[PDB]
């Protein structure tokens, strides 16, 4: 059973997650309840769940929470840590290709939530100028938890403690989440992306300016470990009808498995430049 409400999940020890939570709590009349290992906040709008577990290791947490409440998807609210120290708002779906160094299992992918991710990004774009020093960017699929069956995605703030403690940054994310949760448009074109650096530049531009959204995205560092069958799993899991390639990143070797996957799954392959040109929004 999936119910019809959306669930925001955060970690008790995550500063960013907590600030996002505090802001989300003012958007509706909530009632806290402590069941099992969680702290649940209920309302007739959306749900919020607090766990003491580190999110990247929260495999099967959707099954655990589903014992107490019904929800159709999860929006993980968390901080983003990076050595670049850049101030950014990011979105990505968890999952691993060849290595599972930070949660989950190898070659396992979490169920994405392409529509909500898209609505969130457009709602964020609308407010980005409130925090001029911040920039938005997608993150390729990486890190745990990989064992999540309910549609999901991670909505984060980074890259250091300076940003995690940023009250307004968390408030902007919370507002974008509320807009995503209430959004009715659920027919954005869905694709799995292949190619690019860890911050998926092409995919980020596509998310901000076209009618396309993404489920999973695989960075160039994953090329050697990708297989045609793994890509088919990603496409079907994402409910994608397309595979978009970063034509400047993909090599002939990876293009072969991409084409293989496209044929087996019955989806169309499109170059990122063509997507940006023929699928603009306004």
PDB file of C-alpha atoms in Angstrom:
ATOM      1  CA  UNK A   1       0.000   0.000   0.000  1.00  0.00           C
ATOM      2  CA  UNK A   2       1.238   3.499  -0.848  1.00  0.00           C
ATOM      3  CA  UNK A   3      -1.375   5.801   0.647  1.00  0.00           C
ATOM      4  CA  UNK A   4      -1.226   9.222  -1.010  1.00  0.00           C
ATOM      5  CA  UNK A   5       0.857  11.374   1.313  1.00  0.00           C
ATOM      6  CA  UNK A   6       4.510  12.309   0.962  1.00  0.00           C
ATOM      7  CA  UNK A   7       7.101  11.710   3.675  1.00  0.00           C
ATOM      8  CA  UNK A   8      10.094  13.906   4.486  1.00  0.00           C
ATOM      9  CA  UNK A   9      12.862  12.015   6.296  1.00  0.00           C
ATOM     10  CA  UNK A  10      15.751  13.535   8.253  1.00  0.00           C
ATOM     11  CA  UNK A  11      18.483  12.478  10.677  1.00  0.00           C
ATOM     12  CA  UNK A  12      18.428  13.573  14.320  1.00  0.00           C
ATOM     13  CA  UNK A  13      22.160  14.321  14.152  1.00  0.00           C
ATOM     14  CA  UNK A  14      22.083  16.229  10.843  1.00  0.00           C
ATOM     15  CA  UNK A  15      22.132  20.005  11.329  1.00  0.00           C
ATOM     16  CA  UNK A  16      20.897  20.689   7.788  1.00  0.00           C
ATOM     17  CA  UNK A  17      18.172  18.076   8.075  1.00  0.00           C
ATOM     18  CA  UNK A  18      17.068  19.500  11.423  1.00  0.00           C
ATOM     19  CA  UNK A  19      16.826  23.095  10.198  1.00  0.00           C
ATOM     20  CA  UNK A  20      14.851  21.940   7.166  1.00  0.00           C
ATOM     21  CA  UNK A  21      12.612  20.017   9.552  1.00  0.00           C
ATOM     22  CA  UNK A  22      12.015  23.037  11.792  1.00  0.00           C
ATOM     23  CA  UNK A  23      10.874  25.072   8.783  1.00  0.00           C
ATOM     24  CA  UNK A  24       8.643  22.284   7.440  1.00  0.00           C
ATOM     25  CA  UNK A  25       6.983  22.110  10.868  1.00  0.00           C
ATOM     26  CA  UNK A  26       5.560  25.627  10.508  1.00  0.00           C
ATOM     27  CA  UNK A  27       3.867  24.829   7.192  1.00  0.00           C
ATOM     28  CA  UNK A  28       1.075  22.817   8.813  1.00  0.00           C
ATOM     29  CA  UNK A  29      -0.503  21.743  12.101  1.00  0.00           C
ATOM     30  CA  UNK A  30       1.683  18.832  13.179  1.00  0.00           C
ATOM     31  CA  UNK A  31       1.352  16.339  16.020  1.00  0.00           C
ATOM     32  CA  UNK A  32       4.466  14.478  17.147  1.00  0.00           C
ATOM     33  CA  UNK A  33       4.375  10.764  17.931  1.00  0.00           C
ATOM     34  CA  UNK A  34       7.263   8.538  18.957  1.00  0.00           C
ATOM     35  CA  UNK A  35       6.787   5.003  17.663  1.00  0.00           C
ATOM     36  CA  UNK A  36       9.533   2.424  17.372  1.00  0.00           C
ATOM     37  CA  UNK A  37      12.914   3.998  16.674  1.00  0.00           C
ATOM     38  CA  UNK A  38      11.374   7.079  15.042  1.00  0.00           C
ATOM     39  CA  UNK A  39       9.878  10.456  15.871  1.00  0.00           C
ATOM     40  CA  UNK A  40       6.921  11.015  13.555  1.00  0.00           C
ATOM     41  CA  UNK A  41       5.228  14.346  12.887  1.00  0.00           C
ATOM     42  CA  UNK A  42       1.755  14.063  11.387  1.00  0.00           C
ATOM     43  CA  UNK A  43      -0.550  16.506   9.625  1.00  0.00           C
ATOM     44  CA  UNK A  44      -3.170  16.348   6.874  1.00  0.00           C
ATOM     45  CA  UNK A  45      -0.719  17.916   4.419  1.00  0.00           C
ATOM     46  CA  UNK A  46       2.424  15.781   4.576  1.00  0.00           C
ATOM     47  CA  UNK A  47       4.477  13.659   6.990  1.00  0.00           C
ATOM     48  CA  UNK A  48       7.897  14.066   8.605  1.00  0.00           C
ATOM     49  CA  UNK A  49       9.987  11.303  10.160  1.00  0.00           C
ATOM     50  CA  UNK A  50      13.091  11.641  12.294  1.00  0.00           C
ATOM     51  CA  UNK A  51      15.541   8.768  12.731  1.00  0.00           C
ATOM     52  CA  UNK A  52      18.798   8.402  14.654  1.00  0.00           C
ATOM     53  CA  UNK A  53      20.279   6.457  11.754  1.00  0.00           C
ATOM     54  CA  UNK A  54      22.777   7.959   9.333  1.00  0.00           C
ATOM     55  CA  UNK A  55      20.729   8.258   6.119  1.00  0.00           C
ATOM     56  CA  UNK A  56      23.334   6.787   3.743  1.00  0.00           C
ATOM     57  CA  UNK A  57      23.184   3.564   5.774  1.00  0.00           C
ATOM     58  CA  UNK A  58      19.391   3.658   6.131  1.00  0.00           C
ATOM     59  CA  UNK A  59      18.782   0.664   3.832  1.00  0.00           C
ATOM     60  CA  UNK A  60      15.165  -0.578   4.090  1.00  0.00           C
ATOM     61  CA  UNK A  61      14.132   2.428   6.168  1.00  0.00           C
ATOM     62  CA  UNK A  62      11.055   2.832   3.960  1.00  0.00           C
ATOM     63  CA  UNK A  63       9.841  -0.636   4.986  1.00  0.00           C
ATOM     64  CA  UNK A  64      10.442   0.209   8.649  1.00  0.00           C
ATOM     65  CA  UNK A  65       8.515   3.480   8.494  1.00  0.00           C
ATOM     66  CA  UNK A  66       5.686   1.941   6.449  1.00  0.00           C
ATOM     67  CA  UNK A  67       4.706  -0.042   9.533  1.00  0.00           C
ATOM     68  CA  UNK A  68       3.396   3.124  11.176  1.00  0.00           C
ATOM     69  CA  UNK A  69       2.236   5.257   8.232  1.00  0.00           C
ATOM     70  CA  UNK A  70       1.302   5.114   4.557  1.00  0.00           C
ATOM     71  CA  UNK A  71       3.274   7.264   2.127  1.00  0.00           C
ATOM     72  CA  UNK A  72       3.827   7.224  -1.643  1.00  0.00           C
ATOM     73  CA  UNK A  73       7.358   8.605  -1.602  1.00  0.00           C
ATOM     74  CA  UNK A  74      10.221   9.902   0.507  1.00  0.00           C
ATOM     75  CA  UNK A  75      12.044  13.215   0.321  1.00  0.00           C
ATOM     76  CA  UNK A  76      15.273  12.773   2.293  1.00  0.00           C
ATOM     77  CA  UNK A  77      16.398  16.089   3.775  1.00  0.00           C
ATOM     78  CA  UNK A  78      20.114  16.122   4.495  1.00  0.00           C
ATOM     79  CA  UNK A  79      23.359  18.037   4.411  1.00  0.00           C
ATOM     80  CA  UNK A  80      25.860  17.634   1.580  1.00  0.00           C
ATOM     81  CA  UNK A  81      29.549  17.392   2.453  1.00  0.00           C
ATOM     82  CA  UNK A  82      32.169  18.276  -0.155  1.00  0.00           C
ATOM     83  CA  UNK A  83      35.839  19.228  -0.182  1.00  0.00           C
ATOM     84  CA  UNK A  84      35.125  21.974  -2.719  1.00  0.00           C
ATOM     85  CA  UNK A  85      33.412  23.930   0.044  1.00  0.00           C
ATOM     86  CA  UNK A  86      31.007  25.449  -2.490  1.00  0.00           C
ATOM     87  CA  UNK A  87      27.633  26.783  -1.338  1.00  0.00           C
ATOM     88  CA  UNK A  88      25.089  24.625  -3.139  1.00  0.00           C
ATOM     89  CA  UNK A  89      21.606  23.135  -3.123  1.00  0.00           C
ATOM     90  CA  UNK A  90      21.660  19.617  -4.566  1.00  0.00           C
ATOM     91  CA  UNK A  91      19.366  16.822  -5.678  1.00  0.00           C
ATOM     92  CA  UNK A  92      20.230  13.189  -6.356  1.00  0.00           C
ATOM     93  CA  UNK A  93      18.927   9.661  -5.941  1.00  0.00           C
ATOM     94  CA  UNK A  94      20.948   7.139  -3.939  1.00  0.00           C
ATOM     95  CA  UNK A  95      22.408   3.990  -5.473  1.00  0.00           C
ATOM     96  CA  UNK A  96      25.738   2.321  -6.252  1.00  0.00           C
ATOM     97  CA  UNK A  97      27.416   1.063  -9.380  1.00  0.00           C
ATOM     98  CA  UNK A  98      30.762  -0.711  -8.907  1.00  0.00           C
ATOM     99  CA  UNK A  99      31.556   0.352  -5.332  1.00  0.00           C
ATOM    100  CA  UNK A 100      29.583   0.824  -2.111  1.00  0.00           C
ATOM    101  CA  UNK A 101      31.997   2.781   0.091  1.00  0.00           C
ATOM    102  CA  UNK A 102      29.332   4.958   1.660  1.00  0.00           C
ATOM    103  CA  UNK A 103      26.230   2.905   2.292  1.00  0.00           C
ATOM    104  CA  UNK A 104      24.062   0.392   0.500  1.00  0.00           C
ATOM    105  CA  UNK A 105      25.021  -2.562  -1.677  1.00  0.00           C
ATOM    106  CA  UNK A 106      27.025  -2.793  -4.922  1.00  0.00           C
ATOM    107  CA  UNK A 107      25.112  -2.517  -8.206  1.00  0.00           C
ATOM    108  CA  UNK A 108      21.907  -1.662  -6.346  1.00  0.00           C
ATOM    109  CA  UNK A 109      19.745   1.396  -7.027  1.00  0.00           C
ATOM    110  CA  UNK A 110      17.069   3.153  -4.986  1.00  0.00           C
ATOM    111  CA  UNK A 111      13.706   3.872  -6.602  1.00  0.00           C
ATOM    112  CA  UNK A 112      13.818   7.484  -7.889  1.00  0.00           C
ATOM    113  CA  UNK A 113      11.009  10.066  -7.773  1.00  0.00           C
ATOM    114  CA  UNK A 114      11.590  11.952 -11.092  1.00  0.00           C
ATOM    115  CA  UNK A 115       8.430  14.061 -11.041  1.00  0.00           C
ATOM    116  CA  UNK A 116       8.843  15.421  -7.518  1.00  0.00           C
ATOM    117  CA  UNK A 117      12.554  15.990  -8.033  1.00  0.00           C
ATOM    118  CA  UNK A 118      11.614  18.113 -11.066  1.00  0.00           C
ATOM    119  CA  UNK A 119       8.887  20.094  -9.317  1.00  0.00           C
ATOM    120  CA  UNK A 120      11.276  20.698  -6.438  1.00  0.00           C
ATOM    121  CA  UNK A 121      13.994  22.039  -8.734  1.00  0.00           C
ATOM    122  CA  UNK A 122      11.654  24.418 -10.556  1.00  0.00           C
ATOM    123  CA  UNK A 123      10.259  25.667  -7.227  1.00  0.00           C
ATOM    124  CA  UNK A 124      13.832  26.194  -6.031  1.00  0.00           C
ATOM    125  CA  UNK A 125      14.869  27.997  -9.216  1.00  0.00           C
ATOM    126  CA  UNK A 126      12.043  30.455  -8.546  1.00  0.00           C
ATOM    127  CA  UNK A 127      13.615  31.333  -5.172  1.00  0.00           C
ATOM    128  CA  UNK A 128      17.350  30.982  -5.875  1.00  0.00           C
ATOM    129  CA  UNK A 129      17.899  34.750  -6.030  1.00  0.00           C
ATOM    130  CA  UNK A 130      17.056  34.997  -2.326  1.00  0.00           C
ATOM    131  CA  UNK A 131      20.432  33.350  -1.661  1.00  0.00           C
ATOM    132  CA  UNK A 132      22.666  34.837  -4.415  1.00  0.00           C
ATOM    133  CA  UNK A 133      25.809  33.218  -2.991  1.00  0.00           C
ATOM    134  CA  UNK A 134      24.249  29.785  -3.550  1.00  0.00           C
ATOM    135  CA  UNK A 135      24.079  27.765  -6.737  1.00  0.00           C
ATOM    136  CA  UNK A 136      21.912  24.797  -7.675  1.00  0.00           C
ATOM    137  CA  UNK A 137      23.283  21.587  -9.112  1.00  0.00           C
ATOM    138  CA  UNK A 138      22.273  17.995  -9.630  1.00  0.00           C
ATOM    139  CA  UNK A 139      24.501  15.261  -8.238  1.00  0.00           C
ATOM    140  CA  UNK A 140      24.898  11.980 -10.090  1.00  0.00           C
ATOM    141  CA  UNK A 141      23.549   8.809  -8.492  1.00  0.00           C
ATOM    142  CA  UNK A 142      25.875   7.754  -5.672  1.00  0.00           C
ATOM    143  CA  UNK A 143      26.112   6.564  -2.064  1.00  0.00           C
ATOM    144  CA  UNK A 144      23.566   4.668  -0.009  1.00  0.00           C
ATOM    145  CA  UNK A 145      20.901   3.906   0.868  1.00  0.00           C
ATOM    146  CA  UNK A 146      20.420   1.586  -2.109  1.00  0.00           C
ATOM    147  CA  UNK A 147      17.687  -0.592  -0.635  1.00  0.00           C
ATOM    148  CA  UNK A 148      14.713   1.767  -0.953  1.00  0.00           C
ATOM    149  CA  UNK A 149      11.635   0.599  -2.882  1.00  0.00           C
ATOM    150  CA  UNK A 150       9.467   3.662  -2.372  1.00  0.00           C
ATOM    151  CA  UNK A 151      10.188   6.484  -4.834  1.00  0.00           C
ATOM    152  CA  UNK A 152      12.773   8.804  -3.292  1.00  0.00           C
ATOM    153  CA  UNK A 153      15.501  11.411  -3.642  1.00  0.00           C
ATOM    154  CA  UNK A 154      17.882  13.461  -1.503  1.00  0.00           C
ATOM    155  CA  UNK A 155      17.396  17.224  -1.174  1.00  0.00           C
ATOM    156  CA  UNK A 156      20.485  18.773   0.377  1.00  0.00           C
ATOM    157  CA  UNK A 157      22.414  21.898   1.327  1.00  0.00           C
ATOM    158  CA  UNK A 158      26.095  22.215   1.140  1.00  0.00           C
ATOM    159  CA  UNK A 159      29.057  21.798   1.353  1.00  0.00           C
ATOM    160  CA  UNK A 160      30.292  22.560   4.869  1.00  0.00           C
ATOM    161  CA  UNK A 161      29.029  23.293   8.378  1.00  0.00           C
ATOM    162  CA  UNK A 162      28.745  26.959   7.419  1.00  0.00           C
ATOM    163  CA  UNK A 163      25.986  26.058   4.976  1.00  0.00           C
ATOM    164  CA  UNK A 164      24.433  23.294   7.085  1.00  0.00           C
ATOM    165  CA  UNK A 165      23.725  25.802   9.856  1.00  0.00           C
ATOM    166  CA  UNK A 166      22.365  28.365   7.382  1.00  0.00           C
ATOM    167  CA  UNK A 167      18.814  29.003   8.615  1.00  0.00           C
ATOM    168  CA  UNK A 168      17.579  30.742   5.473  1.00  0.00           C
ATOM    169  CA  UNK A 169      19.099  28.159   3.144  1.00  0.00           C
ATOM    170  CA  UNK A 170      17.069  25.519   4.999  1.00  0.00           C
ATOM    171  CA  UNK A 171      13.984  27.733   4.810  1.00  0.00           C
ATOM    172  CA  UNK A 172      14.361  28.061   1.036  1.00  0.00           C
ATOM    173  CA  UNK A 173      14.698  24.286   0.691  1.00  0.00           C
ATOM    174  CA  UNK A 174      11.653  23.746   2.909  1.00  0.00           C
ATOM    175  CA  UNK A 175       9.552  26.087   0.767  1.00  0.00           C
ATOM    176  CA  UNK A 176      10.673  24.385  -2.434  1.00  0.00           C
ATOM    177  CA  UNK A 177       9.797  21.022  -0.881  1.00  0.00           C
ATOM    178  CA  UNK A 178       6.318  22.203   0.081  1.00  0.00           C
ATOM    179  CA  UNK A 179       5.742  23.370  -3.506  1.00  0.00           C
ATOM    180  CA  UNK A 180       6.969  20.016  -4.808  1.00  0.00           C
ATOM    181  CA  UNK A 181       4.691  18.160  -2.402  1.00  0.00           C
ATOM    182  CA  UNK A 182       1.638  20.127  -3.576  1.00  0.00           C
ATOM    183  CA  UNK A 183       2.572  20.092  -7.290  1.00  0.00           C
ATOM    184  CA  UNK A 184       0.131  18.546  -9.736  1.00  0.00           C
ATOM    185  CA  UNK A 185       2.231  18.255 -12.902  1.00  0.00           C
ATOM    186  CA  UNK A 186       3.523  14.668 -12.977  1.00  0.00           C
ATOM    187  CA  UNK A 187       4.066  14.175 -16.710  1.00  0.00           C
ATOM    188  CA  UNK A 188       7.586  15.492 -17.218  1.00  0.00           C
ATOM    189  CA  UNK A 189       9.641  13.435 -19.693  1.00  0.00           C
ATOM    190  CA  UNK A 190      11.810  11.021 -17.687  1.00  0.00           C
ATOM    191  CA  UNK A 191      15.348  10.000 -18.557  1.00  0.00           C
ATOM    192  CA  UNK A 192      18.301   8.153 -17.108  1.00  0.00           C
ATOM    193  CA  UNK A 193      21.464  10.138 -17.770  1.00  0.00           C
ATOM    194  CA  UNK A 194      24.851   8.742 -18.729  1.00  0.00           C
ATOM    195  CA  UNK A 195      28.047  10.775 -18.702  1.00  0.00           C
ATOM    196  CA  UNK A 196      29.452  13.882 -17.063  1.00  0.00           C
ATOM    197  CA  UNK A 197      31.352  14.845 -13.926  1.00  0.00           C
ATOM    198  CA  UNK A 198      29.912  14.241 -10.431  1.00  0.00           C
ATOM    199  CA  UNK A 199      27.825  17.433 -10.541  1.00  0.00           C
ATOM    200  CA  UNK A 200      26.244  16.521 -13.903  1.00  0.00           C
ATOM    201  CA  UNK A 201      26.486  19.947 -15.652  1.00  0.00           C
ATOM    202  CA  UNK A 202      24.415  19.019 -18.714  1.00  0.00           C
ATOM    203  CA  UNK A 203      21.736  17.286 -16.635  1.00  0.00           C
ATOM    204  CA  UNK A 204      21.575  20.283 -14.287  1.00  0.00           C
ATOM    205  CA  UNK A 205      20.883  22.636 -17.216  1.00  0.00           C
ATOM    206  CA  UNK A 206      18.279  20.187 -18.512  1.00  0.00           C
ATOM    207  CA  UNK A 207      16.594  20.093 -15.076  1.00  0.00           C
ATOM    208  CA  UNK A 208      16.431  23.892 -14.905  1.00  0.00           C
ATOM    209  CA  UNK A 209      15.340  24.727 -18.464  1.00  0.00           C
ATOM    210  CA  UNK A 210      13.592  21.817 -20.200  1.00  0.00           C
ATOM    211  CA  UNK A 211      10.556  19.538 -19.881  1.00  0.00           C
ATOM    212  CA  UNK A 212      12.882  16.688 -18.912  1.00  0.00           C
ATOM    213  CA  UNK A 213      13.626  15.252 -15.504  1.00  0.00           C
ATOM    214  CA  UNK A 214      15.933  12.434 -14.435  1.00  0.00           C
ATOM    215  CA  UNK A 215      15.678   9.316 -12.344  1.00  0.00           C
ATOM    216  CA  UNK A 216      19.250   8.060 -12.126  1.00  0.00           C
ATOM    217  CA  UNK A 217      22.422   9.606 -13.544  1.00  0.00           C
ATOM    218  CA  UNK A 218      25.791   7.918 -13.953  1.00  0.00           C
ATOM    219  CA  UNK A 219      29.074   9.835 -13.932  1.00  0.00           C
ATOM    220  CA  UNK A 220      31.972   9.160 -16.267  1.00  0.00           C
ATOM    221  CA  UNK A 221      33.824   7.455 -13.395  1.00  0.00           C
ATOM    222  CA  UNK A 222      31.225   4.661 -13.535  1.00  0.00           C
ATOM    223  CA  UNK A 223      31.623   3.858 -17.269  1.00  0.00           C
ATOM    224  CA  UNK A 224      33.901   0.822 -16.844  1.00  0.00           C
ATOM    225  CA  UNK A 225      31.540  -0.789 -14.341  1.00  0.00           C
ATOM    226  CA  UNK A 226      28.270  -0.160 -16.173  1.00  0.00           C
ATOM    227  CA  UNK A 227      26.636  -3.000 -18.099  1.00  0.00           C
ATOM    228  CA  UNK A 228      23.747  -2.940 -20.553  1.00  0.00           C
ATOM    229  CA  UNK A 229      21.646  -4.897 -18.041  1.00  0.00           C
ATOM    230  CA  UNK A 230      22.410  -2.502 -15.198  1.00  0.00           C
ATOM    231  CA  UNK A 231      21.297   0.403 -17.394  1.00  0.00           C
ATOM    232  CA  UNK A 232      18.072  -1.450 -18.219  1.00  0.00           C
ATOM    233  CA  UNK A 233      17.440  -1.850 -14.487  1.00  0.00           C
ATOM    234  CA  UNK A 234      17.987   1.884 -13.977  1.00  0.00           C
ATOM    235  CA  UNK A 235      15.635   2.818 -16.821  1.00  0.00           C
ATOM    236  CA  UNK A 236      12.835   0.515 -15.664  1.00  0.00           C
ATOM    237  CA  UNK A 237      13.295   1.594 -12.049  1.00  0.00           C
ATOM    238  CA  UNK A 238      13.180   5.263 -13.081  1.00  0.00           C
ATOM    239  CA  UNK A 239      10.161   4.613 -15.328  1.00  0.00           C
ATOM    240  CA  UNK A 240      12.202   6.425 -17.969  1.00  0.00           C
ATOM    241  CA  UNK A 241      11.305   6.565 -21.646  1.00  0.00           C
ATOM    242  CA  UNK A 242      14.725   7.939 -22.598  1.00  0.00           C
ATOM    243  CA  UNK A 243      18.457   7.776 -21.973  1.00  0.00           C
ATOM    244  CA  UNK A 244      20.236  11.114 -22.355  1.00  0.00           C
ATOM    245  CA  UNK A 245      23.978  11.108 -22.994  1.00  0.00           C
ATOM    246  CA  UNK A 246      26.538  13.821 -22.323  1.00  0.00           C
ATOM    247  CA  UNK A 247      27.953  13.578 -25.853  1.00  0.00           C
ATOM    248  CA  UNK A 248      31.202  15.209 -24.731  1.00  0.00           C
ATOM    249  CA  UNK A 249      31.655  12.763 -21.853  1.00  0.00           C
ATOM    250  CA  UNK A 250      30.585   9.369 -23.211  1.00  0.00           C
ATOM    251  CA  UNK A 251      33.039   7.309 -25.257  1.00  0.00           C
ATOM    252  CA  UNK A 252      32.215   4.779 -27.974  1.00  0.00           C
ATOM    253  CA  UNK A 253      32.515   1.954 -25.443  1.00  0.00           C
ATOM    254  CA  UNK A 254      29.822   3.299 -23.132  1.00  0.00           C
ATOM    255  CA  UNK A 255      27.682   4.419 -26.083  1.00  0.00           C
ATOM    256  CA  UNK A 256      27.556   0.769 -27.115  1.00  0.00           C
ATOM    257  CA  UNK A 257      26.059  -0.412 -23.830  1.00  0.00           C
ATOM    258  CA  UNK A 258      23.768   2.622 -23.800  1.00  0.00           C
ATOM    259  CA  UNK A 259      22.410   1.651 -27.225  1.00  0.00           C
ATOM    260  CA  UNK A 260      22.164  -1.965 -26.078  1.00  0.00           C
ATOM    261  CA  UNK A 261      20.135  -0.892 -23.034  1.00  0.00           C
ATOM    262  CA  UNK A 262      17.950   1.436 -25.091  1.00  0.00           C
ATOM    263  CA  UNK A 263      17.046  -1.411 -27.461  1.00  0.00           C
ATOM    264  CA  UNK A 264      16.310  -3.945 -24.718  1.00  0.00           C
ATOM    265  CA  UNK A 265      14.192  -1.511 -22.696  1.00  0.00           C
ATOM    266  CA  UNK A 266      12.563   0.021 -25.764  1.00  0.00           C
ATOM    267  CA  UNK A 267      13.554   3.598 -25.006  1.00  0.00           C
ATOM    268  CA  UNK A 268      15.061   6.387 -27.113  1.00  0.00           C
ATOM    269  CA  UNK A 269      18.608   7.753 -26.813  1.00  0.00           C
ATOM    270  CA  UNK A 270      19.020  11.547 -27.036  1.00  0.00           C
ATOM    271  CA  UNK A 271      22.089  13.808 -26.992  1.00  0.00           C
ATOM    272  CA  UNK A 272      22.027  16.459 -24.237  1.00  0.00           C
ATOM    273  CA  UNK A 273      22.399  19.298 -26.746  1.00  0.00           C
ATOM    274  CA  UNK A 274      19.315  18.129 -28.645  1.00  0.00           C
ATOM    275  CA  UNK A 275      17.317  17.924 -25.405  1.00  0.00           C
ATOM    276  CA  UNK A 276      18.331  21.444 -24.364  1.00  0.00           C
ATOM    277  CA  UNK A 277      17.331  22.727 -27.806  1.00  0.00           C
ATOM    278  CA  UNK A 278      14.091  20.890 -28.615  1.00  0.00           C
ATOM    279  CA  UNK A 279      12.567  20.681 -25.122  1.00  0.00           C
ATOM    280  CA  UNK A 280      12.821  24.168 -23.588  1.00  0.00           C
ATOM    281  CA  UNK A 281      10.387  25.500 -21.092  1.00  0.00           C
ATOM    282  CA  UNK A 282       8.811  28.708 -21.274  1.00  0.00           C
TER     283      UNK A 282
END
